C-alpha cells in the first residue's frame, strides 16, 4: 500500500526510457503477485494511489486497461498474471511499431517541428535517421520544465540539425516546417489528444498553414475522456501534483490532427473511436 509507491518510483529510477504508464503496469502486475474474487477492488485502490503520485493521463489510462485487460478474462489469478505478462510483452514493442510506421512519413530533406520531449518522437527520428533519411528538427523549449532542451540534447547525438526554438515562436517557424510530429500523453475518445501545454496552439497554427500534424501515441494511452473544450480536461491531469494559471496539458481537437501513428497501426483521428469502442 506504501511499498507500491516506492516501487513505482524505483521502476522510474532504473529506467527513465520506460514510459510512465508502463512503469505503472509493471508495479501494478508485481502488486498482483501478492480472495481473488473482487480483486478489482484491490487493484482499483492501487490505480488511485498510482494516479495520486503521477498526474499524467497515461498512468490513469494504461493502468485502467490493465484493470480490464485482466477483467476481460471474466486459480484465475495464474491466467491473470499470464495474460498480464503477455500485455507487458506486447507494449514493450509499441515504440518500434510506431517508428516503423511513422519514419516512412518523413520526406528526405524535410524539416519537422516537434514539441516538448517524448520517447516516441525521439524514436521516430532515431528510426528515420537509421533509414538514411536526412532532415532538420525544430523543437520548442516548452515551459516550465524546459524539456525541449532535454530533447534537443538527446537528439543532437543522432547528428540531426536541431533548433531549440522559443516557446512563443511556433507561429513564426510553422512556415519553415514540413510536418509537425508530437507525442500524445493521452488520446481521448474523439481522436484528439491530450499533450504537454502548447500542443494545441502548435496544431491551430499548423492547420492555419495546412502543415500535416502527426501524433505518435501508443495503445495504452487511449483514455475514455471526451473533452469539448479545454475546460473538460479534468484538474487531475492539467495541474501536476502575479497570479498564475499554469496547466500542464491541453486538449487538441481531432480536426487539427492529420494522422495518429499509434501502436495498433496508422489511424485517422476518426479511426480512434472504435479502437476505444472495441475495448469498451
Amino acid at each position: 500500500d506504501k511499498e507500491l509507491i516506492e516501487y513505482f518510483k524505483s521502476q522510474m529510477k532504473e529506467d527513465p526510457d520506460m514510459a510512465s504508464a508502463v512503469a505503472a503496469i509493471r508495479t501494478l502486475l508485481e502488486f498482483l503477485k501478492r480472495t481473488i474474487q473482487g480483486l478489482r477492488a484491490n487493484l482499483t485502490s492501487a490505480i488511485e494511489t498510482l494516479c495520486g503520485v503521477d498526474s499524467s493521463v497515461a498512468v490513469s489510462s494504461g493502468g485502467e486497461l490493465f484493470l480490464r485487460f485482466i477483467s476481460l478474462a471474466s486459480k484465475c489469478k495464474k491466467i491473470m498474471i499470464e495474460r498480464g505478462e503477455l500485455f507487458l510483452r506486447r507494449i514493450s514493442l509499441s515504440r518500434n511499431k510506431i517508428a516503423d510506421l511513422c519514419h516512412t512519413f518523413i520526406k528526405d530533406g524535410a524539416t519537422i517541428l516537434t514539441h516538448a520531449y517524448s520517447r516516441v518522437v525521439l524514436r521516430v527520428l532515431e528510426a528515420a535517421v537509421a533509414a538514411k533519411k536526412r532532415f532538420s528538427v525544430y523543437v520548442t523549449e516548452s515551459q516550465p520544465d524546459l524539456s525541449g532542451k532535454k530533447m534537443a540534447k538527446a537528439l543532437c547525438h543522432l547528428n540531426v540539425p536541431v533548433t531549440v526554438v522559443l516557446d512563443a515562436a511556433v507561429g513564426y517557424i510553422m512556415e519553415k516546417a514540413d510536418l509537425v510530429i508530437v507525442g500524445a500523453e493521452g488520446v481521448v475518445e474523439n481522436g484528439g489528444i491530450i499533450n504537454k501545454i502548447g500542443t494545441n496552439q502548435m496544431a491551430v497554427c499548423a492547420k492555419a498553414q495546412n502543415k500535416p500534424f502527426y501524433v505518435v501515441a501508443e495503445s495504452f494511452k487511449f483514455v475514455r475522456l471526451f473533452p469539448l473544450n479545454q475546460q473538460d480536461v479534468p484538474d487531475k491531469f492539467k495541474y501536476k501534483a502575479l497570479k498564475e494559471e499554469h496547466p500542464w496539458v491541453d486538449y487538441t481537437a481531432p480536426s487539427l490532427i492529420t494522422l495518429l501513428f499509434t501502436d495498433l497501426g496508422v489511424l485517422t483521428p476518426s479511426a480512434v473511436s472504435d479502437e476505444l469502442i472495441k475495448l469498451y
Binding site: 516512412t104 497501426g265 485517422t268
Partner: protein, 314 residues
C-alpha cells in the same frame, strides 16, 4: 508454360501501359485464379508466398496502378480466411476458387450498384461537374439521366484531353453537357451544385489519388462548399497511406505538355507532366461505393474487412 508466359505478358503490359480499371481487376483475378490452380503447392503458406511474390512483381511493374495490388491483397485475404475456417487441406484449392468466383461476380456488378444510387444524389435542374473520363461516373450520370434532367460540365483534363470523349459519351445519352478548359474550374464553380469524380485509388485515410486536375477541383469545391461526391468501387480501395517513402505520382513524357517541335528551349526548360494528383480527405464529401455511400472517415473500417493488416506491405 502458358501461364508463366501470360504472367510476364501481364507484367510487361503493365510496364508499357497497353484497358479500364474494372478490366484490370478482372484480368488480375483471372491471372491469380490461374496461379492458384496450375502451380503445385502443398499448403496455404507456400501459395501465399507465391501470390505475394507475383503481386510484388506486378506491383513493382507499375506502382501507380494499384488495382492489381488491391486484387492481389483481396485474394490473399480470401486465402487466409478460407484456410482459417478450415483450421494441407484438399478442398482448400476448390474453396478459394469459389470465393474468387464470388469475387468475380462481386465485380461486373460494381458499376450497376454504384449507378443504382444515382437518383438519390442527382436531382432535376442540377448542375454536376466532373473532370476525367471514368466509366463509373458516366454510368452514374447515365442512370440518373433516365429519370431526371440535369446539366453536366465535363472539365477536360489538359494533357490527355479525356473529358472530350466523356462529354461526347454523355451528350449521346442526352445530358446537356459543357466542355471546359481546366482553367475555368474556379470560374464556373459558383454555378456548380455537386462535383462527381472518379479515382485511380482511394488511399487508406480516405484520401484519393485521381486524375491530375482533381485536387485543383477539390479546392474549388471546398471553397464554394460544393459537395465532392466520389464514385469509386472497392477494387480502387488501396490500403496504402500517403507516405513519402512510396512514390504515388506517375510522370509521363513531356511531349504531352510541351511538344518536341519547340526546339532549342527544350534543352533549358524542365517540363514534367504528372498524371495523378493527391486529394486529401477533408475535401471529400462522400464515397459512393458499390455497398453504399459512406463517408471518408469510414474508409479505414473498409480496409479491415477487405485486406488483412499483414497484407498491406506484401
Amino acid at each position: 508454360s502458358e501461364l508463366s508466359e501470360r504472367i510476364e505478358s501481364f507484367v510487361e503490359t503493365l510496364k508499357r501501359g497497353g484497358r479500364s480499371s474494372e478490366e484490370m481487376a478482372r484480368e488480375t483475378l483471372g491471372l491469380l485464379r490461374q496461379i492458384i490452380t496450375d502451380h503445385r503447392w502443398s499448403n496455404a503458406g507456400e501459395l501465399m508466398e507465391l501470390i505475394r511474390r507475383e503481386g510484388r512483381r506486378m506491383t513493382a511493374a507499375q506502382p501507380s496502378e494499384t488495382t492489381v495490388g488491391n486484387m492481389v491483397r483481396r485474394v490473399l485475404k480470401i486465402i487466409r480466411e478460407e484456410y482459417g475456417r478450415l483450421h494441407h487441406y484438399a478442398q482448400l484449392q476448390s474453396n478459394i476458387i469459389e470465393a474468387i468466383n464470388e469475387l468475380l461476380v462481386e465485380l461486373e456488378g460494381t458499376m450497376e450498384n454504384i449507378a443504382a444510387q444515382a437518383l438519390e444524389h442527382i436531382h432535376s435542374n442540377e448542375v454536376i461537374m466532373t473532370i476525367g473520363f471514368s466509366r463509373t461516373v458516366e454510368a452514374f450520370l447515365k442512370e440518373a439521366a433516365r429519370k431526371r434532367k440535369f446539366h453536366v460540365i465535363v472539365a477536360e483534363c489538359a494533357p490527355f484531353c479525356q473529358g472530350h470523349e466523356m462529354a461526347v459519351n454523355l451528350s449521346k445519352a442526352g445530358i446537356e453537357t459543357t466542355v471546359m478548359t481546366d482553367a475555368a474550374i474556379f470560374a464556373v464553380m459558383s454555378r456548380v451544385n455537386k462535383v462527381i469524380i472518379g479515382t485511380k485509388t482511394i488511399l487508406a485515410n480516405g484520401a484519393l489519388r485521381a486524375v491530375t486536375g482533381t485536387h485543383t477541383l477539390a479546392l474549388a469545391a471546398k471553397h464554394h462548399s460544393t459537395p465532392l461526391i466520389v464514385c469509386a468501387p472497392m477494387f480502387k480501395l488501396s490500403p496504402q497511406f500517403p507516405n513519402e517513402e512510396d512514390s504515388f505520382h506517375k510522370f509521363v513524357a513531356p511531349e504531352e505538355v510541351l511538344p518536341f517541335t519547340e526546339g532549342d528551349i527544350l534543352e533549358k526548360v524542365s517540363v514534367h507532366c504528372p498524371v495523378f494528383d493527391y486529394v486529401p480527405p477533408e475535401l471529400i464529401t462522400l464515397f459512393i461505393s458499390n455497398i453504399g455511400g459512406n463517408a471518408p472517415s469510414y474508409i479505414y473500417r473498409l480496409m479491415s474487412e477487405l485486406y488483412h493488416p499483414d497484407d498491406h506491405v506484401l
